[PDB]
Amino acid sequence: AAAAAANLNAVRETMDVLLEISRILNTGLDMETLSICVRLCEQGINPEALSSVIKELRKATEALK
Amino acid sequence: KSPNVLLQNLCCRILGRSEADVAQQFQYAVRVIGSNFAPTVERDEFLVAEKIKKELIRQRREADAALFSELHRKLHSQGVLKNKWSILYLLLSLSEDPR
Amino acid sequence: RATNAQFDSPEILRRLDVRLLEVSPGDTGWDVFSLDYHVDGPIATVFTRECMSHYLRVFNF
């Protein structure tokens, strides 16, 4: 109602503060991928396993070109 | 969201392709993520936060080390996350120094 | 022990060591090369701990 629109506002705050953390450390991810990894993290996911996929997807965007 | 479509959704952000253009990369994602869908280590947010500070020292900046304290304050302030260790270890592990 | 710092006291050069910086995804040894002098006892107050943390920042420059 109201607290769930404050929730919907606090999630747009959370992606922005994680975008700030993503840019100051100079990671490869942009804002569009960053909204997917958090959805993966709410269900529970191993970041050691996700990082091995992320270091291959971005190295396979120019191996199918 | 189902995980099988969510990993495909990751594959469509990284590779700019349709969800049926690319299924080899999506197959490698289903290959790796499966049977390790839970973290393999003990976790707390505090240790990886104090290593993100160690990461900001490595790039020769200490003003962001005190800005990142308030950026991690906002995460505790909202409380809309399930795992705050996991995304932060991911963003730490994918880092790179510009030198 | 191949230069003009062999003529100094052995204790001071002995306590020096190379240290690898805390946390690093794979990159040059230039970013993670450091030195650490071991010191204990009474003079650890004159050689203040926080002052060593600033000394490494001078050392990087």
Side-chain angles (χ1 to χ4, degrees):
Chain A
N7 282 353
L8 173 146
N9 166 243
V11 170
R12 295 295 61 66
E13 278 156 8
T14 306
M15 306 308 167
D16 194 349
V17 304
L18 296 168
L19 186 52
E20 189 81 282
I21 297 175
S22 74
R23 290 184 294 172
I24 299 300
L25 317 172
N26 204 40
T27 71
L29 316 97
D30 201 2
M31 172 56 156
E32 296 72 68
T33 296
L34 183 50
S35 197
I36 300 301
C37 280
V38 45
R39 296 166 184 267
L40 285 170
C41 175
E42 299 309 282
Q43 66 217 39
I45 195 171
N46 190 14
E48 184 270 303
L50 199 43
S51 60
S52 51
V53 190
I54 294 167
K55 60 91 185 171
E56 291 303 344
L57 279 202
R58 294 181 310 112
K59 317 194 311 225
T61 47
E62 65 290 344
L64 316 160
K65 197 164 187 177
Chain B
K1 302 88 199 193
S2 76
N4 47 282
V5 76
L6 193 47
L7 274 299
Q8 222 187 28
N9 288 357
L10 183 74
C11 177
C12 85
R13 329 306 171 183
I14 298 297
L15 305 101
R17 291 181 159 84
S18 71
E19 286 278 67
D21 203 331
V22 50
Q24 195 52 257
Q25 298 304 286
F26 167 53
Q27 193 46 237
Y28 174 79
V30 171
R31 176 203 182 249
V32 170
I33 299 299
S35 59
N36 279 118
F37 201 57
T40 191
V41 300
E42 184 269 354
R43 54 141 293 165
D44 58 336
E45 294 99 357
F46 184 69
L47 189 46
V48 284
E50 301 292 275
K51 290 163 76 171
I52 296 171
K53 281 171 183 63
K54 285 178 177 299
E55 178 61 38
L56 292 170
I57 302 300
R58 185 179 64 92
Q59 317 175 88
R60 275 83 182 179
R61 298 186 283 274
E62 283 72 58
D64 50 359
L67 174 65
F68 168 67
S69 45
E70 303 169 271
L71 270 297
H72 199 46
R73 188 269 310 274
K74 275 181 167 57
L75 210 76
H76 276 64
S77 77
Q78 307 322 122
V80 76
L81 304 104
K82 194 68 58 179
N83 289 4
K84 298 170 175 61
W85 164 86
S86 311
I87 48 172
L88 291 182
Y89 185 70
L90 188 49
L91 277 175
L92 171 145
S93 45
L94 314 181
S95 289
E96 182 159 42
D97 186 24
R99 193 265 304 159
Chain C
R1 290 296 184 126
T3 183
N4 311 145
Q6 70 189 4
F7 291 105
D8 298 335
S9 86
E11 60 180 5
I12 54 167
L13 59 94
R14 160 187 161 195
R15 281 150 192 173
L16 319 176
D17 53 14
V18 174
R19 199 188 41 77
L20 162 58
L21 233 89
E22 336 275 282
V23 330
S24 56
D27 213 316
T28 52
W30 296 99
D31 302 322
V32 285
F33 190 81
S34 65
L35 268 294
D36 189 19
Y37 174 65
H38 169 86
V39 71
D40 282 330
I43 63 175
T45 59
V46 185
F47 300 128
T48 301
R49 200 281 321 149
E50 159 195 324
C51 181
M52 312 314 295
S53 71
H54 288 67
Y55 278 155
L56 72 89
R57 286 183 264 261
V58 194
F59 161 88
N60 173 58
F61 204 104

Coordinates of all heavy atoms in Angstrom, one line a residue, chain C residues 20-57:
Chain C
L20 N 53.1 -8.9 0.7 CA 52.1 -8.8 -0.3 C 50.9 -8.1 0.3 O 50.4 -8.4 1.4 CB 51.7 -10.3 -0.8 CG 50.4 -10.6 -1.5 CD1 50.2 -9.8 -2.8 CD2 50.2 -12.0 -1.8
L21 N 50.4 -7.1 -0.5 CA 49.3 -6.3 0.0 C 48.0 -7.1 0.2 O 47.8 -8.1 -0.5 CB 49.0 -5.2 -1.0 CG 49.0 -3.7 -0.5 CD1 50.4 -3.1 -0.5 CD2 48.0 -2.9 -1.3
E22 N 47.1 -6.7 1.1 CA 45.9 -7.4 1.5 C 44.9 -7.3 0.4 O 44.6 -6.1 0.0 CB 45.4 -6.9 2.8 CG 46.5 -6.3 3.7 CD 47.3 -7.3 4.5 OE1 46.8 -7.7 5.6 OE2 48.4 -7.6 4.1
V23 N 44.4 -8.4 -0.2 CA 43.3 -8.5 -1.3 C 43.9 -8.0 -2.6 O 44.4 -6.9 -2.7 CB 41.9 -8.0 -0.9 CG1 41.6 -8.1 0.6 CG2 41.6 -6.5 -1.4
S24 N 43.6 -8.9 -3.6 CA 44.1 -8.6 -5.0 C 43.6 -9.6 -6.0 O 44.1 -10.8 -6.1 CB 45.6 -8.6 -5.1 OG 46.2 -9.8 -4.6
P25 N 42.6 -9.3 -6.9 CA 42.4 -10.0 -8.1 C 43.6 -9.7 -9.0 O 44.2 -8.6 -9.0 CB 41.1 -9.3 -8.7 CG 40.4 -8.8 -7.5 CD 41.4 -8.4 -6.6
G26 N 44.0 -10.7 -9.8 CA 45.3 -10.8 -10.5 C 45.7 -9.6 -11.4 O 45.1 -9.2 -12.4
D27 N 46.9 -9.0 -10.9 CA 47.5 -7.8 -11.5 C 48.9 -7.8 -11.1 O 49.4 -8.6 -10.3 CB 46.7 -6.6 -11.1 CG 46.7 -5.5 -12.2 OD1 47.7 -5.3 -12.8 OD2 45.6 -4.9 -12.4
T28 N 49.6 -6.8 -11.6 CA 51.1 -6.6 -11.4 C 51.5 -6.6 -10.0 O 50.8 -6.1 -9.1 CB 51.5 -5.2 -12.1 OG1 50.7 -4.2 -11.6 CG2 51.4 -5.3 -13.6
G29 N 52.7 -7.1 -9.8 CA 53.4 -7.0 -8.5 C 53.7 -5.6 -8.0 O 53.9 -5.4 -6.8
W30 N 53.7 -4.6 -9.0 CA 53.9 -3.2 -8.6 C 52.8 -2.7 -7.7 O 53.1 -1.8 -6.9 CB 53.9 -2.4 -9.9 CG 55.1 -2.7 -10.8 CD1 55.0 -3.5 -11.9 CD2 56.4 -2.2 -10.7 NE1 56.3 -3.6 -12.5 CE2 57.1 -2.8 -11.8 CE3 57.1 -1.4 -9.9 CZ2 58.5 -2.5 -12.0 CZ3 58.4 -1.1 -10.1 CH2 59.1 -1.6 -11.2
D31 N 51.6 -3.2 -7.8 CA 50.5 -2.7 -7.0 C 50.5 -3.3 -5.6 O 49.8 -2.7 -4.8 CB 49.2 -2.9 -7.7 CG 49.1 -2.3 -9.1 OD1 49.6 -1.2 -9.3 OD2 48.5 -2.9 -10.0
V32 N 51.2 -4.4 -5.4 CA 51.1 -5.1 -4.1 C 52.5 -5.3 -3.5 O 52.6 -6.1 -2.6 CB 50.4 -6.4 -4.4 CG1 48.9 -6.2 -4.6 CG2 51.0 -7.2 -5.5
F33 N 53.5 -4.7 -4.1 CA 54.8 -4.7 -3.4 C 54.8 -3.8 -2.3 O 54.5 -2.6 -2.4 CB 55.9 -4.4 -4.4 CG 57.3 -4.7 -3.9 CD1 57.8 -6.0 -3.9 CD2 58.0 -3.7 -3.3 CE1 59.0 -6.2 -3.3 CE2 59.3 -3.9 -2.8 CZ 59.8 -5.2 -2.8
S34 N 55.2 -4.3 -1.1 CA 55.3 -3.4 0.1 C 56.5 -4.0 0.9 O 57.0 -5.1 0.7 CB 54.1 -3.4 0.9 OG 53.7 -4.6 1.4
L35 N 56.9 -3.2 1.9 CA 57.9 -3.6 2.9 C 57.3 -3.5 4.3 O 56.4 -2.6 4.5 CB 59.2 -2.7 2.9 CG 60.4 -3.1 2.0 CD1 61.1 -4.3 2.5 CD2 60.0 -3.2 0.6
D36 N 57.7 -4.3 5.2 CA 57.3 -4.3 6.6 C 58.5 -4.4 7.5 O 59.2 -5.5 7.4 CB 56.2 -5.3 6.9 CG 55.6 -5.1 8.2 OD1 55.7 -4.0 8.8 OD2 55.0 -6.1 8.8
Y37 N 58.7 -3.5 8.3 CA 59.8 -3.5 9.3 C 59.2 -4.1 10.6 O 58.2 -3.5 11.1 CB 60.5 -2.2 9.6 CG 61.5 -2.2 10.7 CD1 62.7 -2.9 10.6 CD2 61.3 -1.4 11.8 CE1 63.6 -2.9 11.6 CE2 62.2 -1.4 12.9 CZ 63.4 -2.1 12.7 OH 64.3 -2.1 13.8
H38 N 59.8 -5.1 11.1 CA 59.4 -5.7 12.4 C 60.0 -4.9 13.5 O 61.2 -4.6 13.6 CB 59.8 -7.1 12.5 CG 59.6 -7.7 13.9 ND1 58.4 -8.2 14.3 CD2 60.4 -7.8 15.0 CE1 58.5 -8.6 15.6 NE2 59.8 -8.4 16.0
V39 N 59.1 -4.4 14.5 CA 59.6 -3.7 15.6 C 58.7 -4.0 16.8 O 57.5 -4.1 16.6 CB 59.8 -2.2 15.4 CG1 58.5 -1.5 15.2 CG2 60.7 -1.6 16.4
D40 N 59.3 -4.2 18.0 CA 58.5 -4.5 19.2 C 59.1 -3.7 20.4 O 60.1 -3.0 20.2 CB 58.5 -6.0 19.5 CG 57.6 -6.8 18.7 OD1 56.5 -6.2 18.3 OD2 57.8 -8.0 18.5
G41 N 58.5 -3.8 21.5 CA 59.1 -3.3 22.7 C 58.7 -1.9 23.1 O 57.7 -1.4 22.8
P42 N 59.7 -1.2 23.7 CA 59.4 0.2 24.1 C 59.4 1.2 23.0 O 58.5 2.1 23.0 CB 60.6 0.5 25.1 CG 61.7 -0.5 24.7 CD 61.0 -1.7 24.2
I43 N 60.3 1.1 22.0 CA 60.3 2.1 20.9 C 59.2 2.0 20.0 O 59.1 2.8 19.1 CB 61.7 2.0 20.2 CG1 61.8 0.6 19.5 CG2 62.8 2.2 21.1 CD1 63.0 0.4 18.6
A44 N 58.3 1.0 20.1 CA 57.1 0.9 19.4 C 56.1 2.0 19.7 O 55.1 2.2 19.0 CB 56.4 -0.4 19.7
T45 N 56.3 2.8 20.8 CA 55.5 4.0 21.0 C 56.1 5.2 20.3 O 55.3 6.0 19.7 CB 55.5 4.3 22.5 OG1 56.8 4.4 23.0 CG2 54.9 3.1 23.3
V46 N 57.4 5.3 20.2 CA 58.0 6.4 19.4 C 57.8 6.1 17.9 O 57.4 7.0 17.2 CB 59.5 6.5 19.8 CG1 60.1 7.7 19.0 CG2 59.7 6.7 21.3
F47 N 58.1 4.8 17.5 CA 57.6 4.3 16.2 C 56.2 3.9 16.3 O 55.8 2.7 16.3 CB 58.5 3.2 15.8 CG 60.0 3.6 15.6 CD1 60.9 2.8 16.3 CD2 60.4 4.7 14.9 CE1 62.3 3.1 16.1 CE2 61.7 5.0 14.8 CZ 62.7 4.2 15.4
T48 N 55.3 4.9 16.4 CA 53.8 4.7 16.6 C 53.2 3.9 15.5 O 53.6 4.0 14.3 CB 53.2 6.1 16.8 OG1 53.8 6.7 17.9 CG2 51.7 6.0 17.0
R49 N 52.3 3.0 15.8 CA 51.7 2.1 14.9 C 50.9 2.8 13.8 O 51.0 2.4 12.6 CB 50.7 1.1 15.7 CG 50.3 -0.2 15.0 CD 49.2 -0.1 13.9 NE 48.2 0.9 14.3 CZ 47.5 1.6 13.4 NH1 47.8 1.5 12.1 NH2 46.6 2.5 13.9
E50 N 50.1 3.8 14.1 CA 49.3 4.6 13.1 C 50.3 5.3 12.2 O 50.0 5.5 11.0 CB 48.4 5.5 13.9 CG 47.8 6.7 13.1 CD 47.2 7.7 14.1 OE1 46.5 7.2 15.0 OE2 47.3 8.9 13.8
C51 N 51.4 5.7 12.7 CA 52.4 6.5 12.0 C 53.1 5.6 10.9 O 53.4 6.0 9.8 CB 53.4 7.0 13.0 SG 54.8 7.9 12.3
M52 N 53.2 4.3 11.2 CA 53.6 3.3 10.2 C 52.7 3.2 9.0 O 53.1 3.1 7.9 CB 53.9 1.9 10.8 CG 54.6 1.9 12.1 SD 56.1 2.9 12.1 CE 57.1 2.1 10.9
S53 N 51.4 3.2 9.4 CA 50.3 3.2 8.3 C 50.4 4.4 7.4 O 50.0 4.3 6.3 CB 48.9 3.0 9.0 OG 48.6 4.2 9.6
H54 N 50.8 5.5 8.0 CA 51.0 6.7 7.1 C 52.3 6.6 6.3 O 52.4 7.1 5.2 CB 50.9 7.9 7.9 CG 49.5 8.2 8.3 ND1 48.8 7.4 9.2 CD2 48.6 9.2 7.9 CE1 47.5 7.9 9.4 NE2 47.4 9.0 8.6
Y55 N 53.3 5.9 6.9 CA 54.6 5.8 6.3 C 54.6 4.9 5.1 O 55.3 5.2 4.1 CB 55.6 5.1 7.3 CG 56.2 6.1 8.3 CD1 56.6 5.6 9.5 CD2 56.3 7.4 8.0 CE1 57.2 6.5 10.4 CE2 56.9 8.3 8.9 CZ 57.3 7.8 10.1 OH 57.9 8.7 11.0
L56 N 53.7 3.9 5.0 CA 53.5 3.1 3.8 C 52.9 4.0 2.7 O 53.3 3.7 1.5 CB 52.6 1.9 4.1 CG 51.1 2.0 4.3 CD1 50.2 1.9 3.1 CD2 50.7 0.9 5.3
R57 N 52.1 5.0 3.0 CA 51.5 5.8 2.0 C 52.6 6.7 1.4 O 52.6 7.1 0.2 CB 50.4 6.6 2.6 CG 49.1 5.8 2.8 CD 48.0 6.7 3.3 NE 47.9 6.7 4.7 CZ 47.0 5.9 5.4 NH1 46.2 5.2 4.7 NH2 47.0 5.9 6.7

